[PDB]
């Protein structure tokens, strides 16, 4: 997703 820092790298 675009402008998402999630945790699942």
């Given at each position: 997703?675009?402008?998402?820092?999630?945790?699942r790298?």
């Amino acid at each position: 997703r675009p402008g998402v820092l999630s945790s699942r790298q």
